[model samples]
Target chain A: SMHNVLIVGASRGIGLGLADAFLQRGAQVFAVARRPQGSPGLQALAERAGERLQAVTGDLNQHDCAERIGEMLGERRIDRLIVNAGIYGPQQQDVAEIDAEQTAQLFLTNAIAPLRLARALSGRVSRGGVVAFMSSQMASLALGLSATMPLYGASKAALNSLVRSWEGEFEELPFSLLLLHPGWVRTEMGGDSAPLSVEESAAGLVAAVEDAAGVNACRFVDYRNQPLPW
Target chain B: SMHNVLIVGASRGIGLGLADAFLQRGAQVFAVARRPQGSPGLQALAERAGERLQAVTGDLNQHDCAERIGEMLGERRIDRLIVNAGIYGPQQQDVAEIDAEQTAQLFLTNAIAPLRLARALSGRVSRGGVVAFMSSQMASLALGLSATMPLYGASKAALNSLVRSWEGEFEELPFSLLLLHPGWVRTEMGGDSAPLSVEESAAGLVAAVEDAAGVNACRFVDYRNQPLPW
Candidate 1:
């Protein structure tokens, strides 16, 4: 009875948590993951939700990711599209130590792929729909994180810029763009020491998506609707 | 008797103009061009300046760019290092049109190359020296440009973020980092209708670099010394 929601990187962690949250709200959730069979969380969610949840397999890094996902969706227009996949890059954050190859991979995964997917799927998003990205507080240029997350921060910042450019290029964009910072939640990527739990972050992110409907503008906000610095 | 300056991308445009400006100030200038012999401007400048100007061939896109240039410099320390190479990617600015390869090449040339070179050559810069990056006003997140220059804007934005990270990563950075916006200079990239001339922009950029000697911090400023939004 609720909105039709499509989530990228819905296999595990915060993404999986998001699928759980949205299903509870009675949304028709299309879960996109690299390998759905390998993901117990996604598989479990699909079993409980039945036809309300559809699992689509696609890799964001692949050149044909958008086309494949688009083909799968057909003429079905979704209310919200959340791109939640990203990498933390190398364990080492040494500025001088990052190679050309590493830089390419990090930016490609974090920034470029998401943009490409969003652009490709824009037509599939209903008019006045919301397109969300799993950005971070680290992406905020004004209140950005220190060198602790250097390369990751840079990649997210690029994503932010690209999103803004995406909005700016169009005079009357059909959908609202939501750049969501899901707080520092405890997950494999966020580590155990992180304060917020996956459930807490996902609930807020779901609420944020709900709040963005019909607000045809680009916004960078945290889970609590706190506006982030550009 | 001014200073030993190394200018990357010195084959033409703003880079060549910067090379000329530094040379006029009596600094021993090292011009690193991809192909110096093919550049008439660089060759002519090299002829007039003679011993004061050294042309070194290096490509920023190459992995070993820093190593090759460092080898040439040997034990010599540069008082100022200016990285001014970048490209305006794909004539078409359509959001969905950009492919994976284009994204990699743009970020590689605009963002990654400069950071890699800076990190590699940070030790080669004297204490209290200035290391400047030829960033753009469009890089500013708060004062960012519209969709007309999206990818270019994103690349420069990444450069800004990376420079900030570079400064943040080091507790006691030896040299100050400068991100310079050379304004709308009339060059091949800027086109004939641009407001400022190459000489004017380069002069202000040279002055900005001179002003950064002992600042001991990271700053994003325009050719006129006005601070830009990050």
Candidate 2:
């Protein structure tokens, strides 16, 4: 049986790679991104895959995307809901710069939007399926560090917090909840300094997503499937 | 040489109790409350303490309160910054019922405000002093919530995450950071069915603040000083 995969932020980077990987595995990929037209090679990739790949316009910062998506996915049960839409902060932000506006916007894009999408699409999500948030090790409270701007980490932390807070809603059903840290991949966000390639990270992530349904528990795991500090 | 202590949300419940506890020890207690003039027994408390207990108005939900706090402090160095404020949710809220606006308000009131206040006042705080975020075990990934919805837990988790993110800032300043769970005490928030009393919790908290400077490291511990799992 084929899976119905929805990968948000699929125009480029990890989302695009994830879309490619899922399509390869015969999972119908709903590739949602802010700029579908500008998505590097996405149109060509979808054209090659035909109906198996769909380019969806989704902007996490706004409300219309969710409403539009709900209408698009009326009764179809999604086998995988990949919340991959998020943005990293600039290189520097001091403690004073961590204001209400910055935190709210960051969390809205990185946390609230994903949570809202999860809820909006929950009616069409399978009970035994996987719902994965593209989180980071920087969100880990136990692995606490201090030597950088907290904008990205704080957003990711709030995202992880939502996952922790919503475990009951997902776990009570047959769904598998995953907060996945996709390693230091060489995407535009991760930059050339990152260790892993897009292919490498996507392979591990998709593999983890496939294995997640049978796990029967909420997992905060890395790309390699290693458990992360909460 | 009296140390200056600022306890936000000091009008009632544990916040009020904390104000009393700190004042008892001869610290210059600035009890910052949303409605200082309207607080149940704040006027009476202030009358008894005279000039020792200063009632500074503050509402955490708004940004202007943070600026007001900075002005009030002037050249005063805060020896203890007790962000002892938070709120629980309704009886239950399903995932669909978890409105974005409500949760964000809760988080802003509970977590963001505290963190922002910490940052705003960091310059005026003593290097060896304590800054305690009133967190809960509900925020604990180790100790999951079972009976109720996770609204409150999620907010605290965000607060703890901010603490983790800002650990470097505090550590570099040589200040002791504490994520202190004041326990299920009998208060307006905790209710009469709660396990502990205001007196016990307040005593432990005051003692914790006094000892925090000597410890010289960040501590995520309960009122009893027992370390909690992140």
Candidate 3:
């Protein structure tokens, strides 16, 4: 059976890259996003794979997004669920300068929404399927430096907490809960000045997701798969 | 000089207990709440020490609640800010049965509101002043049992994270930020069936806050000042 993958927020950037990689690997990709754009990369992948790729458009921020995704997939068990949707808020001078409303919105979109998606999809992902969340190294409690992204950091930190608790709750399940911090990749959110390329980050994430069985349990790993400190 | 103290959610329960303790110690107490109904305990305390206590009423859940509290304080500097306010969702249920809106409200009131208050009052609290947050042992990342209170656990976990980051940011001012796990205290919120009494918990917490100067920094401690695992 082809690996059935669900990539939330796969309309653009790193999410798109993840969808493409799974498609290339002969996986049936369910690319879920708010706006299902016709990107050159996504179009190319869809053309090559035909019926193997299905793009579903909806706001994952909606409470019903996960259930809807599950319903769309019918009886097909999700082999992997990749939560890649997020935002960095408007570029700002510092934490004090950033708008509080924007910060809250960022938290809702980047942190709580992913967990909601996970909660919705948890029952559908096969006993041994992987649930991967795309977090950032900036979210690291040990390495937090900027005051500008306090809201962002708080959201991600909360996300880490969610992962830790979920891992404990789902310990008996065959699948793994992996929280991967894709280190400052070159995506629109990562910006034009980012240091690492999307290929480098996505490839590492793909490897991590593929080898989910062999790795440590409930670990927060970097793009290079090194364990991160809470 | 008397230590000027601000206790949020001081209408009743632990907040009320803390206010009484502070007033008895000769601190100028600013008792804040949604409806500052002077509880029997608070009424008695104020009767004996009228000048030492001031009841300020307002909902902490409101966006402007922080500013309202700040403005109410006038020119008086706060020596210690005790965030003792919190809310429990209706009753514990399975994850599937959990109410999302109620869960979010609980988190907003119990977790995020305290942080917002901290941000609003940062300038008013004296340098080296104590910032005590009433967290619970259930917030422990190491002690999560397979049960329903996931929303509560998640909010407390997030609060603990805020404490850690706040400690880092405010380290320069050298302010003391304490993350306290009050254990299983018998109160209305803790339920009538709880094992520990409110007085016992309050006494232990007071002791912890009094001697909070020399203990673990950025650490989560039990009511007795015992260190909890991160």
Best by TM-score: 1
Q: Residue A4 deviation, candidate 2, in Å?
A: 1.9
Candidate 1, A1-230: lDDT as tens digits: 14789999999889999999999999999899999999999889978999898999998887778788878878778899999988998787655566657877887789878888888788878999999999988877677474678778888888888888788777797888989999999989999899999999999999988888887888899989889887
Residue-level lDDT tens digits of model 1 in B1-230:
46889999999999999999999999999999999999999999999999889999999878789999899888889899999879997777554566656777787788877888888888889999999999887787776464678778888888888888777767777888999999885544635767888999999999988888987877888888889887
Question: Best to worst by lDDT, what's the order?
Answer: 1, 2, 3
Highest lDDT scorer: 1
Model 2 has a DockQ score of: 0.39
Instruction: Give per-residue CA lDDT, model 2, range B1-230, as digits (tens).
Output: 89999998898888898988887888898999888999866787799898889999888766687688878888898889999878774346443454556656666777777887887787788878888889887778766662264657766777787777777654264688898888876544544667788878988978877778856577888878888888
Candidate 1: segments with Cα more than 4 A from true spot: A67-74, A95-101, B93-101, B186-192
TM-score of each: 0.93, 0.88, 0.86
Docking class of 2: acceptable
Candidate 2, A161-218: lDDT as tens digits: 6676667554365677899999988887888899998889999999889888755478
Looking at candidate 3, what is the lDDT of residue B146?
Answer: 17
List model 3 lDDT by residue over B205-228, tens digit each. Answer: 777877765343555677788887
Give a tens-digit lDDT track for model 3, residues A134-218: 8766556556443435556666766666666666665375577888887777787678888878777777788788877533356
Q: Which pairs clash inside model 3?
A: A95-A148
